[PDB]
């Protein structure tokens, strides 16, 4: 009768910003303020619905992504960046929240940790909730190029290298992104 | 990984210009050649593709000139003919992936041409 | 062709004050910086409009929009010595910069 908040909030890895999970949570009765109770997250802020009274008033579903620390600005309606525009892009009626907390001793090591990614380049900008997995060779104005890079052409990933040391903007914050969707439909998610 | 350059170092005043640069794969990276004559700047004076799909020519050294690649003998070659002239000569590239942009270059050689 | 113009044909600059290399072109967006420290090959140092390359110290910072881009050196310490360059590439005639000598003083 529980959602699955230990696996979403309490996971061993999350996945990179450009492919980001999403888990559909339904036939539950949550209780909200658990994590708002808790308060250890550097950013919680619910748009749209009214936060610590949401406990009360279909589904919700789960993103999750880990970002460096100065890009949680973006994970907002009605940003743009390398985050907003290329990699996920929140919609401009979004109802729900971002939950953000400074993983540093968890996400990064000595050296670097260069499994994370990001899109740099793209052609255009994300329709709000689109993921993009392709890795082909982003050309820029002119020349095409068959699956080579050189100039004028570029691999379209571009790692984050999480040294354990980096300034607190260039640190691993891991971003949950709960959105809450009411349909013409039963409801199987409620507060109790 | 480092791109060495080979040439014959002289050259008639009316022979052709031709030489090597020897190199990962040819068909990895898209490919060039740039020269600097002295006194002046760099000059771009064409490119292959990696998988010999094409060529590109400077338009205005476009006239005599031809770039050849191999794909197992690990060669990247420059042919112009009637020999703008006496410079040095770079074969150069364009690395990327996730750690950043590498970019790897050749060291130069210069062939002295009458201009 | 496209073909660009460097405003400094060359710079004097005391160590310790910022420096400025401008770049107007004829007509996300392919233009490169270089430098040539005297006697060797060409090192990519800005590789799109505002972007850094691998091994490149802090002080550096690609900028601008339109056709006036700018590579501003932040903190000029005395090793910064040579040629600065912009590749466009947005056509098939690429192009590299006239250079700009910079002068230590």
């Known amino acids: 009768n529980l959602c699955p908040f230990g696996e979403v909030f309490n996971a061993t890895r999350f996945a990179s910003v450009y492919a980001w999970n999403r888990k559909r949570i339904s036939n539950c009765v949550a209780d909200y303020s658990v994590l708002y109770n808790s308060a250890s997250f550097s950013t919680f802020k619910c748009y749209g619905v009214s936060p610590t009274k949401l406990n009360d008033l279909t589904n919700v579903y789960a993103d999750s992504f880990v970002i460096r620390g100065d890009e949680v600005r973006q994970i907002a309606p009605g940003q743009t960046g390398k985050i907003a525009d290329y990699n996920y892009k929140l919609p401009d009626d979004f109802t729900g929240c971002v939950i953000a907390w400074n993983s540093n001793n968890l996400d990064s090591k000595v050296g670097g940790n260069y499994n994370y990614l990001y899109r740099l380049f793209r052609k255009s900008n994300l329709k709000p909730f689109e993921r993009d997995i392709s890795t082909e060779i982003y050309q820029a104005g002119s020349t095409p190029c068959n699956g080579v890079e050189g100039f004028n052409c570029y691999f379209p990933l571009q790692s984050y290298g999480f040294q354990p040391t980096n300034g607190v903007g260039y640190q691993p914050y891991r971003v949950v992104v709960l959105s809450f969707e009411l349909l013409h439909a039963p409801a199987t998610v409620c507060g109790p | 990984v480092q791109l060495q350059e080979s040439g014959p170092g002289l050259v008639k005043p009316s022979e052709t210009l031709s030489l090597t640069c020897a190199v990962?794969?040819?068909?990895?990276?898209?490919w060039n050649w740039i020269r600097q004559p002295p006194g002046k700047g760099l000059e771009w004076i064409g490119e292959?593709?990696?998988?010999?799909?094409?060529?590109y020519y400077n338009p205005s050294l476009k006239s005599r000139v031809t770039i050849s690649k191999d794909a197992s003998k690990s060669q990247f070659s420059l042919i112009l003919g009637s020999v703008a002239d006496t410079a040095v000569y770079y074969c150069?590239?364009?690395?990327?992936?996730?750690?950043?942009?590498?970019?790897?270059w050749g060291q130069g050689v210069l062939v002295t041409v009458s201009s | 062709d496209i073909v660009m113009t460097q405003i400094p044909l060359s710079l004097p600059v005391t160590p310790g004050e910022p420096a400025s290399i401008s770049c107007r072109s004829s007509?996300?967006?392919?233009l490169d910086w270089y430098l040539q420290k005297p006697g060797q090959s060409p090192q990519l140092l800005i590789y799109?409009?505002?972007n850094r390359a691998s091994g490149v110290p802090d002080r550096f910072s690609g900028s601008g929009s339109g056709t006036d881009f700018t590579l501003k050196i932040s903190r000029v310490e005395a090793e910064d010595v040579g040629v600065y360059y912009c590749?466009?590439?947005?056509?098939?005639?690429?192009?590299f910069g006239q250079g700009t000598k910079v002068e230590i003083k």
């Open positions: 150069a590239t364009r690395d990327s992936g996730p750690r950043g942009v590498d970019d790897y």
């Open positions: 990962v794969s040819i068909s990895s990276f898209l």
């Open positions: 292959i593709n990696g998988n010999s799909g094409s060529t």
């Open positions: 007509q996300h967006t392919s």
């Open positions: 799109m409009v505002s």
């Open positions: 590749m466009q590439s947005v056509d098939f005639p690429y192009s």
